[PDB]
Write a protein that binds this ligand. Structure first.
Ligand SMILES: COc1cc2c(cc1NS(C)(=O)=O)=CC1=C(NCc3c(C)cccc3C)N=NC=21
Length: 243
């Protein structure tokens, strides 16, 4: 490509993470994740356009690519995926830590909103957590019914406000410590119940103020839902009030 092209001689593979993605070192000093690529050349080149043109502190940062063989090299996120990070009971989270996980994602989403980029799959499983516990959204490129507003499920109407909906569900995931949304319903029953105006209950760890913020993401009318800029302000206000 250009400066984005990484010499694969400078990569050291140290451990396998999952599926294939491996932990490694770049030029000796830099900790990295290395994805072995499945997908066509047109589908890769479009996914490259996104990663190379978007950059924020709370988005998983591309470092480079190896396209003369193929690897995608990124920022390393020591604590792995957010959903599993939440589920590990050893952490024993204070509620302030949980609100700060929401703020991180919201900052990422407010950036993506400012660039008119639609994420389309915001959920805890697609967020990663670094060594300092900072949560970052994977912009990179089984329908996610439980994260979808009614206008997506019925009409496939995607917009900034369907990401907002999803973010609300992501907050719920965080405050429930990584439970499945609507865990006792099927996907089909979830789509029916949300059409009838049913919404997720307030998790015990979520205060009334925090719950109001996540609930504002689930208004039936898409245009009644806030922007990510508004949500960020509301989160910041609660952080100052409740701590
Ligand atoms: C150690 O824990 C982990 C850490 C990471 C991780 C998975 C785990 N383990 S697990 C499977 O969750 O149990 C995936 C990444 C990643 N970026 C991945 C990525 C690359 C390389 C290229 C393009 C797009 C993306 C999203 N940076 N750090 C981690």
């Amino acid at each position: 490509y250009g400066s984005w092209e990484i010499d694969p001689k400078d990569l050291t593979f140290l451990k396998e993470l999952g599926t294939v993605v491996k932990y490694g070192k770049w030029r000796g000093q830099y900790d990295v994740a290395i994805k072995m690529i499945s997908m066509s050349e047109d589908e890769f080149i479009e996914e490259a356009k996104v990663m190379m043109n978007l950059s924020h502190e709370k988005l998983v940062q591309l470092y480079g690519v190896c396209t003369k063989q193929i690897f995608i090299i990124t920022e390393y996120m020591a604590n792995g995926c957010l959903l599993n990070y939440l589920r590990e009971m050893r952490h024993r989270f204070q509620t302030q830590q949980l609100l700060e996980m929401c703020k991180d994602v919201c900052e990422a989403m407010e950036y993506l909103e400012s660039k008119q980029f639609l994420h389309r799959d915001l959920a805890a499983r697609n967020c990663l957590v670094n060594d300092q516990g900072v949560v970052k959204v994977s912009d990179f490129g089984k329908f996610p019914v439980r994260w979808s507003p009614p206008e997506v499920l019925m009409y496939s109407k995607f917009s900034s406000k369907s990401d907002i909906w999803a973010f609300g569900v992501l907050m719920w995931e965080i405050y429930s410590l990584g439970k499945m949304p609507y865990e006792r319903f099927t996907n089909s029953e979830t789509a029916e119940h949300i059409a009838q105006g049913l919404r997720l209950y307030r998790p015990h760890l979520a205060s009334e103020k925090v719950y109001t913020i996540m609930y504002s993401c689930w208004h039936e009318k898409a245009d009644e839902r806030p922007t990510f800029k508004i949500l960020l302000s509301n989160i910041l206000d609660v952080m100052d009030e409740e701590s």
